[PDB]
């Protein structure tokens, strides 16, 4: 390996020892009798100091020949000194140019010349050389880890369901059709039917973190046609609040992990990520519509709350409850899927919920209707053909425990967590109405 | 929740305490002065003991009405006693029937009546109720966790790349073409191009665990048309041996995690999983051809080792070195992808390798050709058009360090680890030439 330590792994204990650092040339200053080389790696910049009387003459002449973004490797002695901005410098014994960069660069890694989003996406390898972008992807990886750790700690087993499928769906829209040899298939939009089927297996507590594909009609700063969904389904619940309780703790865990493990990144983003306050407020759909009405926003009882409505509610909840996160629940049964269980005592409302983060939905879920005959009737109430869901319905006939779950969008979670304007900032290679490359 | 404890969570410590267990009716013994009920959850069976003198009369009359696979929940008192074959029994206070099972069952959960693989795959929710099948999926989840933990402990950052691609066409057949609105696109067979593009970003050490899609020409016991690939790419390496060293440690870690945390599942499977012995043997392609030739198996230099060659070599490696895992490396350059670096001093050989587990490939990798101009010539040598790779090639022009990586099949790893005859046993809903549904 061309390096022994990253910029962040050199501590005082190594003072006076030989180390190897490597990365991209950030800056070179030839100041006559002394020269400086700064190398940038994933964690920061390291200073290479070359006093004329202390380095090999060949090294002294090589430095000024180095160019921005050249990939280099340096072997030298660690010297902790107040004179070094970051606390220590490396006195070089050897400098190897591994690969030279061409010029001009596609994007300005110094951040001085700003680039439009599309140019940045077309050149992601350059984009991540900027600390504020690398910060987002480091945080994305931490969020995925925190989520899986929480699931594991809570007895959940990871499962994997098919993305190439040929079964019915409730909406029949936004599908990506594909030929599967002589048969017709589609890319999966959610593992919903499959995770429910597995509730009849004894697994009981499952999660899956995998891509979902939806051919969204038009672009928005909140949707992508390819995204990563964090799905869970859990059995033997007594109501949907047990699912909401689990979800909020999972989300709080992810937020706290980022706050604990990625403070450096949040600082680079000049962002103060709030300590979660559980339980999050619960706002019934009825109450949400009343609040929107007073704001001049009309939603007829029975219809889903639109994006403007969510935005207005998010602001209202921040102003009135200092709550960046809150649940909308007890939705009209007519506004949610046929697989959601209705309140037996008040059928017009159902056990579904949406978790809103800064006024944008990050997750949808609820308790499912596990009683076969009622489920079948609900399919009919949606004007659909139960026979088209036979492979799924069969799983409810041989001992199906009550269950519930949610789908939590990873990009949605991260975008809202960091209060970013566009979802394209949180996935490396976005897919939207017109973007298919890189 | 309807349960507080799984069958495996009840210990001496809880003797005399009240708990709630829940699961599927496994057996009922209906006697005049006592009823016994056994229920099954994902970890095992729990005995419920109901003497007439001790339980509520309604509960006593309820038990005989229960039927196999009905879902029930039981609240009662833990009672340890040598008279209970499993060590303890639950003296029930309340029993609730959550859902009733129809008969006949799609599959026999008692294991007495065997069913063919196709029938089991069609009724996966029933199939996992058998301990030996549940065991496989618990181990699958364990392997995924171990792999991710190892990546994290070694400084790798998780990334996520597109499964819908314009082209890359780093090959010809075996691709699933798909329309992306007006454009022609394909399902990704590997994140190869993307993880390489990210080696120019500073991330340096990345991994991705995600679906891959391949329209395999032939139906085999070792291939699927949809699989999960564990991919990694790492920068600043000096040769492919650094990648092989990392990979063997990753696989050893996964194996040891299973041996340590799934001993119970390994026992249910009547399988002894060996302790990994590092380093695994490294066998050059030339040496493999010599071993095979000595055995009467002739492989013309330059051709890949076929399935029988792999089987013979795997057997030889066990006999000669008690090595169920070993590497094949220094393959002919003509036999590997354009992105593999050739030995500059012996160009007909390249820095690619395959990891074999019980005579079956579980992973391929190598050091890549990070030098732009040479890479372009190799694209040409493979009969491909460099212009089809502009977004990828662009990443090699602005400071690209040397790098290498591998693709490790999750199903391949698990199938081989457990010495299972068919890869369909290790993924819930397989996709092959003739199976598209469920
Ligand atoms: N096109 C998309 N891009 C990114 N994430 C998505 C997309 N569609 C859904 N999700 C995520 O998956 C979660 C569950 O999916 P669900 O089908 O309930 O979403 P939805 O109600 O269609 O979302 P929306 O109202 O935002 O379009 C959503 O809360 C969101 O986090
Ligand atoms: N159809 C498949 N089903 C399952 N896993 C696969 C499949 N194709 C490839 N893999 C896994 O991905 C790894 C990397 O893919 P690669 O393209 O090197 O495979 P391959 O050499 O074509 O495999 P094989 O020779 O078995 O067909 C393989 O080592 C294997 O573990
Ligand atoms: Mn939607
Ligand atoms: Mn929604
Ligand atoms: Mn929703
Ligand atoms: Mn193949
Ligand atoms: Mn192969
Ligand atoms: Mn291979």
PDB file of N, CA, C and O in Angstrom, chain B residues 107-150:
ATOM      1  N   UNK B 107     -47.213 -27.350   2.014  1.00  0.00           N
ATOM      2  CA  UNK B 107     -46.035 -28.176   2.276  1.00  0.00           C
ATOM      3  C   UNK B 107     -46.199 -28.742   3.671  1.00  0.00           C
ATOM      4  O   UNK B 107     -46.992 -28.228   4.461  1.00  0.00           O
ATOM      5  N   UNK B 108     -45.439 -29.786   3.977  1.00  0.00           N
ATOM      6  CA  UNK B 108     -45.504 -30.443   5.277  1.00  0.00           C
ATOM      7  C   UNK B 108     -44.409 -29.920   6.196  1.00  0.00           C
ATOM      8  O   UNK B 108     -43.244 -30.271   6.053  1.00  0.00           O
ATOM      9  N   UNK B 109     -44.782 -29.095   7.179  1.00  0.00           N
ATOM     10  CA  UNK B 109     -43.818 -28.518   8.117  1.00  0.00           C
ATOM     11  C   UNK B 109     -43.207 -29.508   9.096  1.00  0.00           C
ATOM     12  O   UNK B 109     -42.251 -29.162   9.794  1.00  0.00           O
ATOM     13  N   UNK B 110     -43.774 -30.715   9.176  1.00  0.00           N
ATOM     14  CA  UNK B 110     -43.255 -31.711  10.107  1.00  0.00           C
ATOM     15  C   UNK B 110     -42.058 -32.372   9.489  1.00  0.00           C
ATOM     16  O   UNK B 110     -41.286 -33.021  10.182  1.00  0.00           O
ATOM     17  N   UNK B 111     -41.906 -32.206   8.177  1.00  0.00           N
ATOM     18  CA  UNK B 111     -40.783 -32.806   7.481  1.00  0.00           C
ATOM     19  C   UNK B 111     -40.959 -34.270   7.082  1.00  0.00           C
ATOM     20  O   UNK B 111     -40.088 -34.834   6.425  1.00  0.00           O
ATOM     21  N   UNK B 112     -42.073 -34.891   7.458  1.00  0.00           N
ATOM     22  CA  UNK B 112     -42.299 -36.300   7.117  1.00  0.00           C
ATOM     23  C   UNK B 112     -42.493 -36.509   5.621  1.00  0.00           C
ATOM     24  O   UNK B 112     -41.913 -37.425   5.038  1.00  0.00           O
ATOM     25  N   UNK B 113     -43.317 -35.664   5.006  1.00  0.00           N
ATOM     26  CA  UNK B 113     -43.574 -35.755   3.574  1.00  0.00           C
ATOM     27  C   UNK B 113     -42.667 -34.774   2.835  1.00  0.00           C
ATOM     28  O   UNK B 113     -42.783 -33.554   3.006  1.00  0.00           O
ATOM     29  N   UNK B 114     -41.774 -35.307   2.005  1.00  0.00           N
ATOM     30  CA  UNK B 114     -40.850 -34.470   1.247  1.00  0.00           C
ATOM     31  C   UNK B 114     -41.496 -33.852   0.009  1.00  0.00           C
ATOM     32  O   UNK B 114     -42.436 -34.400  -0.558  1.00  0.00           O
ATOM     33  N   UNK B 115     -40.997 -32.688  -0.397  1.00  0.00           N
ATOM     34  CA  UNK B 115     -41.526 -32.013  -1.576  1.00  0.00           C
ATOM     35  C   UNK B 115     -40.346 -31.624  -2.455  1.00  0.00           C
ATOM     36  O   UNK B 115     -39.242 -31.420  -1.942  1.00  0.00           O
ATOM     37  N   UNK B 116     -40.568 -31.518  -3.762  1.00  0.00           N
ATOM     38  CA  UNK B 116     -39.493 -31.133  -4.669  1.00  0.00           C
ATOM     39  C   UNK B 116     -39.174 -29.639  -4.495  1.00  0.00           C
ATOM     40  O   UNK B 116     -39.987 -28.877  -3.974  1.00  0.00           O
ATOM     41  N   UNK B 117     -37.997 -29.240  -4.958  1.00  0.00           N
ATOM     42  CA  UNK B 117     -37.561 -27.854  -4.830  1.00  0.00           C
ATOM     43  C   UNK B 117     -38.556 -26.877  -5.428  1.00  0.00           C
ATOM     44  O   UNK B 117     -38.900 -25.890  -4.803  1.00  0.00           O
ATOM     45  N   UNK B 118     -39.049 -27.148  -6.634  1.00  0.00           N
ATOM     46  CA  UNK B 118     -40.001 -26.212  -7.257  1.00  0.00           C
ATOM     47  C   UNK B 118     -41.215 -25.927  -6.390  1.00  0.00           C
ATOM     48  O   UNK B 118     -41.661 -24.784  -6.287  1.00  0.00           O
ATOM     49  N   UNK B 119     -41.752 -26.968  -5.759  1.00  0.00           N
ATOM     50  CA  UNK B 119     -42.917 -26.803  -4.915  1.00  0.00           C
ATOM     51  C   UNK B 119     -42.569 -25.990  -3.669  1.00  0.00           C
ATOM     52  O   UNK B 119     -43.369 -25.186  -3.193  1.00  0.00           O
ATOM     53  N   UNK B 120     -41.371 -26.206  -3.142  1.00  0.00           N
ATOM     54  CA  UNK B 120     -40.944 -25.469  -1.960  1.00  0.00           C
ATOM     55  C   UNK B 120     -40.745 -23.999  -2.332  1.00  0.00           C
ATOM     56  O   UNK B 120     -41.181 -23.111  -1.616  1.00  0.00           O
ATOM     57  N   UNK B 121     -40.096 -23.738  -3.460  1.00  0.00           N
ATOM     58  CA  UNK B 121     -39.911 -22.352  -3.887  1.00  0.00           C
ATOM     59  C   UNK B 121     -41.274 -21.670  -4.123  1.00  0.00           C
ATOM     60  O   UNK B 121     -41.427 -20.464  -3.901  1.00  0.00           O
ATOM     61  N   UNK B 122     -42.280 -22.425  -4.563  1.00  0.00           N
ATOM     62  CA  UNK B 122     -43.606 -21.823  -4.777  1.00  0.00           C
ATOM     63  C   UNK B 122     -44.347 -21.497  -3.475  1.00  0.00           C
ATOM     64  O   UNK B 122     -45.322 -20.725  -3.483  1.00  0.00           O
ATOM     65  N   UNK B 123     -43.884 -22.072  -2.367  1.00  0.00           N
ATOM     66  CA  UNK B 123     -44.526 -21.887  -1.073  1.00  0.00           C
ATOM     67  C   UNK B 123     -43.447 -21.608  -0.024  1.00  0.00           C
ATOM     68  O   UNK B 123     -43.376 -22.259   1.021  1.00  0.00           O
ATOM     69  N   UNK B 124     -42.635 -20.599  -0.304  1.00  0.00           N
ATOM     70  CA  UNK B 124     -41.524 -20.258   0.561  1.00  0.00           C
ATOM     71  C   UNK B 124     -41.945 -19.947   1.998  1.00  0.00           C
ATOM     72  O   UNK B 124     -41.225 -20.318   2.931  1.00  0.00           O
ATOM     73  N   UNK B 125     -43.106 -19.308   2.211  1.00  0.00           N
ATOM     74  CA  UNK B 125     -43.556 -19.012   3.583  1.00  0.00           C
ATOM     75  C   UNK B 125     -43.765 -20.311   4.377  1.00  0.00           C
ATOM     76  O   UNK B 125     -43.599 -20.345   5.595  1.00  0.00           O
ATOM     77  N   UNK B 126     -44.148 -21.383   3.700  1.00  0.00           N
ATOM     78  CA  UNK B 126     -44.289 -22.664   4.400  1.00  0.00           C
ATOM     79  C   UNK B 126     -42.913 -23.309   4.603  1.00  0.00           C
ATOM     80  O   UNK B 126     -42.629 -23.902   5.649  1.00  0.00           O
ATOM     81  N   UNK B 127     -42.077 -23.224   3.570  1.00  0.00           N
ATOM     82  CA  UNK B 127     -40.761 -23.848   3.567  1.00  0.00           C
ATOM     83  C   UNK B 127     -39.891 -23.402   4.732  1.00  0.00           C
ATOM     84  O   UNK B 127     -39.244 -24.233   5.369  1.00  0.00           O
ATOM     85  N   UNK B 128     -39.900 -22.107   5.066  1.00  0.00           N
ATOM     86  CA  UNK B 128     -39.068 -21.669   6.189  1.00  0.00           C
ATOM     87  C   UNK B 128     -39.567 -22.100   7.579  1.00  0.00           C
ATOM     88  O   UNK B 128     -38.894 -21.870   8.580  1.00  0.00           O
ATOM     89  N   UNK B 129     -40.741 -22.713   7.658  1.00  0.00           N
ATOM     90  CA  UNK B 129     -41.190 -23.183   8.968  1.00  0.00           C
ATOM     91  C   UNK B 129     -40.416 -24.421   9.389  1.00  0.00           C
ATOM     92  O   UNK B 129     -40.493 -24.849  10.537  1.00  0.00           O
ATOM     93  N   UNK B 130     -39.687 -25.017   8.451  1.00  0.00           N
ATOM     94  CA  UNK B 130     -38.843 -26.175   8.773  1.00  0.00           C
ATOM     95  C   UNK B 130     -37.489 -25.630   9.231  1.00  0.00           C
ATOM     96  O   UNK B 130     -36.904 -24.785   8.569  1.00  0.00           O
ATOM     97  N   UNK B 131     -36.986 -26.105  10.387  1.00  0.00           N
ATOM     98  CA  UNK B 131     -35.705 -25.662  10.940  1.00  0.00           C
ATOM     99  C   UNK B 131     -34.526 -25.668   9.979  1.00  0.00           C
ATOM    100  O   UNK B 131     -33.708 -24.753  10.015  1.00  0.00           O
ATOM    101  N   UNK B 132     -34.430 -26.674   9.113  1.00  0.00           N
ATOM    102  CA  UNK B 132     -33.272 -26.726   8.226  1.00  0.00           C
ATOM    103  C   UNK B 132     -33.299 -25.631   7.141  1.00  0.00           C
ATOM    104  O   UNK B 132     -32.246 -25.245   6.634  1.00  0.00           O
ATOM    105  N   UNK B 133     -34.484 -25.105   6.822  1.00  0.00           N
ATOM    106  CA  UNK B 133     -34.575 -24.060   5.806  1.00  0.00           C
ATOM    107  C   UNK B 133     -34.400 -22.709   6.515  1.00  0.00           C
ATOM    108  O   UNK B 133     -33.639 -21.842   6.052  1.00  0.00           O
ATOM    109  N   UNK B 134     -35.100 -22.530   7.631  1.00  0.00           N
ATOM    110  CA  UNK B 134     -34.947 -21.304   8.404  1.00  0.00           C
ATOM    111  C   UNK B 134     -33.435 -21.139   8.700  1.00  0.00           C
ATOM    112  O   UNK B 134     -32.887 -20.026   8.653  1.00  0.00           O
ATOM    113  N   UNK B 135     -32.761 -22.260   8.974  1.00  0.00           N
ATOM    114  CA  UNK B 135     -31.329 -22.200   9.301  1.00  0.00           C
ATOM    115  C   UNK B 135     -30.532 -21.518   8.186  1.00  0.00           C
ATOM    116  O   UNK B 135     -29.646 -20.710   8.448  1.00  0.00           O
ATOM    117  N   UNK B 136     -30.840 -21.859   6.946  1.00  0.00           N
ATOM    118  CA  UNK B 136     -30.126 -21.254   5.833  1.00  0.00           C
ATOM    119  C   UNK B 136     -30.352 -19.749   5.790  1.00  0.00           C
ATOM    120  O   UNK B 136     -29.407 -18.993   5.607  1.00  0.00           O
ATOM    121  N   UNK B 137     -31.593 -19.306   5.962  1.00  0.00           N
ATOM    122  CA  UNK B 137     -31.791 -17.874   5.889  1.00  0.00           C
ATOM    123  C   UNK B 137     -31.290 -17.089   7.061  1.00  0.00           C
ATOM    124  O   UNK B 137     -30.953 -15.912   6.924  1.00  0.00           O
ATOM    125  N   UNK B 138     -31.195 -17.730   8.222  1.00  0.00           N
ATOM    126  CA  UNK B 138     -30.594 -17.045   9.362  1.00  0.00           C
ATOM    127  C   UNK B 138     -29.089 -16.886   9.053  1.00  0.00           C
ATOM    128  O   UNK B 138     -28.479 -15.861   9.332  1.00  0.00           O
ATOM    129  N   UNK B 139     -28.481 -17.920   8.490  1.00  0.00           N
ATOM    130  CA  UNK B 139     -27.048 -17.860   8.172  1.00  0.00           C
ATOM    131  C   UNK B 139     -26.795 -16.828   7.077  1.00  0.00           C
ATOM    132  O   UNK B 139     -25.812 -16.099   7.135  1.00  0.00           O
ATOM    133  N   UNK B 140     -27.684 -16.751   6.090  1.00  0.00           N
ATOM    134  CA  UNK B 140     -27.522 -15.733   5.046  1.00  0.00           C
ATOM    135  C   UNK B 140     -27.460 -14.344   5.688  1.00  0.00           C
ATOM    136  O   UNK B 140     -26.544 -13.541   5.413  1.00  0.00           O
ATOM    137  N   UNK B 141     -28.420 -14.044   6.551  1.00  0.00           N
ATOM    138  CA  UNK B 141     -28.411 -12.744   7.220  1.00  0.00           C
ATOM    139  C   UNK B 141     -27.110 -12.564   8.019  1.00  0.00           C
ATOM    140  O   UNK B 141     -26.510 -11.463   8.022  1.00  0.00           O
ATOM    141  N   UNK B 142     -26.644 -13.626   8.690  1.00  0.00           N
ATOM    142  CA  UNK B 142     -25.375 -13.506   9.430  1.00  0.00           C
ATOM    143  C   UNK B 142     -24.173 -13.178   8.541  1.00  0.00           C
ATOM    144  O   UNK B 142     -23.309 -12.371   8.925  1.00  0.00           O
ATOM    145  N   UNK B 143     -24.085 -13.850   7.395  1.00  0.00           N
ATOM    146  CA  UNK B 143     -22.984 -13.624   6.467  1.00  0.00           C
ATOM    147  C   UNK B 143     -22.987 -12.177   5.982  1.00  0.00           C
ATOM    148  O   UNK B 143     -21.934 -11.552   5.915  1.00  0.00           O
ATOM    149  N   UNK B 144     -24.167 -11.642   5.660  1.00  0.00           N
ATOM    150  CA  UNK B 144     -24.215 -10.256   5.203  1.00  0.00           C
ATOM    151  C   UNK B 144     -23.709  -9.330   6.302  1.00  0.00           C
ATOM    152  O   UNK B 144     -22.934  -8.386   6.051  1.00  0.00           O
ATOM    153  N   UNK B 145     -24.154  -9.566   7.532  1.00  0.00           N
ATOM    154  CA  UNK B 145     -23.725  -8.692   8.628  1.00  0.00           C
ATOM    155  C   UNK B 145     -22.208  -8.793   8.837  1.00  0.00           C
ATOM    156  O   UNK B 145     -21.527  -7.778   8.967  1.00  0.00           O
ATOM    157  N   UNK B 146     -21.674 -10.007   8.867  1.00  0.00           N
ATOM    158  CA  UNK B 146     -20.231 -10.183   9.090  1.00  0.00           C
ATOM    159  C   UNK B 146     -19.390  -9.459   8.020  1.00  0.00           C
ATOM    160  O   UNK B 146     -18.396  -8.804   8.323  1.00  0.00           O
ATOM    161  N   UNK B 147     -19.791  -9.617   6.768  1.00  0.00           N
ATOM    162  CA  UNK B 147     -19.103  -8.973   5.657  1.00  0.00           C
ATOM    163  C   UNK B 147     -19.106  -7.467   5.831  1.00  0.00           C
ATOM    164  O   UNK B 147     -18.038  -6.828   5.741  1.00  0.00           O
ATOM    165  N   UNK B 148     -20.269  -6.884   6.114  1.00  0.00           N
ATOM    166  CA  UNK B 148     -20.312  -5.427   6.313  1.00  0.00           C
ATOM    167  C   UNK B 148     -19.487  -4.956   7.501  1.00  0.00           C
ATOM    168  O   UNK B 148     -18.825  -3.894   7.435  1.00  0.00           O
ATOM    169  N   UNK B 149     -19.526  -5.726   8.589  1.00  0.00           N
ATOM    170  CA  UNK B 149     -18.755  -5.376   9.784  1.00  0.00           C
ATOM    171  C   UNK B 149     -17.251  -5.380   9.473  1.00  0.00           C
ATOM    172  O   UNK B 149     -16.504  -4.519   9.933  1.00  0.00           O
ATOM    173  N   UNK B 150     -16.815  -6.361   8.699  1.00  0.00           N
ATOM    174  CA  UNK B 150     -15.413  -6.449   8.350  1.00  0.00           C
ATOM    175  C   UNK B 150     -15.024  -5.250   7.486  1.00  0.00           C
ATOM    176  O   UNK B 150     -13.944  -4.634   7.688  1.00  0.00           O
TER     177      UNK B 150
END
